[PDB]
Amino acid sequence: SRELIARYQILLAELAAIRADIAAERTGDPYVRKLARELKRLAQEAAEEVKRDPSSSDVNMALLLILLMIELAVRALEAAERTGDPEVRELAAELVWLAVEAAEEVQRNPSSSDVWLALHLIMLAIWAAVAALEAAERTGDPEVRELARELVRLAVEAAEEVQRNPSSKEVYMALLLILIAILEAVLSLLRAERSGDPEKREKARERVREAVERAEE
């Protein structure tokens, strides 16, 4: 039972390390390259912690989230590259750097629920950020592209505060508020994608503008 889960998680970790390695080889950006090798290091260290001592559920939960964050973060860096936009790449990279820092904290303190939750919210931030930046590249409207950048910049700043103060509930909630704004913006761009008029274009723009103003509070 527990033996089976441990075998399974070691395989997931070995696979996450290869996925990170592959992305490290494919990328054209030195920051992405550095981070993909860090994600690879983390998956390897996880496989080796589970190997030595599979019997701690704290450690198993800590290492499982790190593995899932890696899988997500690698796909997130690859998707952010697929846009060809250097600023998209750099924003995704700053969020992945924060996730790696929050993973290190989880590794050092696997019994802390606040530290685990901080990494977990940063993984959700990465997911939202990549959705926003991908939706914005499909529009080719320059103002929408800039507003989506503005939203993601706010998320980076708020994810840094969470990473550095995982037990603050107001800081945690400030990030959640920005993710809500980001998804409201994504949902407005998608509903415009599947519609007709440039009336819908300016409608979508106004909703994204309103989302950024909400986040800015």
Add this chain to the structure above:
Amino acid sequence: DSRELIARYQILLAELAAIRADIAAERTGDPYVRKLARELKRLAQEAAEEVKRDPSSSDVNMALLLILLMIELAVRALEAAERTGDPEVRELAAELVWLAVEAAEEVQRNPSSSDVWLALHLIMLAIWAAVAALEAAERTGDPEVRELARELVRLAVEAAEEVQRNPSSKEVYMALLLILIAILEAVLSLLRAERSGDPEKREKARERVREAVERAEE
């Protein structure tokens, strides 16, 4: 409340999952994939609606979160299984997604049951493994490997049906987990040979996948 913020967030996640499912329903080109993507859309809308009517039940909120995440995964899995161009890859992924839809309905009907939640969760993990196997096999163009990967996934479909239909059996749960372990060992063998240079590594990868199928079938 913090709960109020989480509920707002999950309603948006659900709205977004419904659109992703719709988009995949429109693009596909296989009628079974189309039918399933519309079911994944329906499940996301019903989840948005249940959180709206009552955000206060932690069982309901957990039941609905897993469904949304399964939808996100299942849609990417059907899309990835179509990108192979192979009608059998398509059909195997579809059978697993159909099982996940059935297991989601059971979760909706019984959100307080831990066994039923875990059954949906293991089937979502099965979908993840199955697509990794079928994608790695498409990379190789070796006909035997592609056939062994199909055999592994067919075993997972059969074992996922048994989990779906008997969520409280521990032996059946473990039987699926054992198959997923075999599938990941096979994926790991294919990717490690995809990297290497030694052209004997193809036959080495093949023999490790053969051994993985043997373990699964036990």
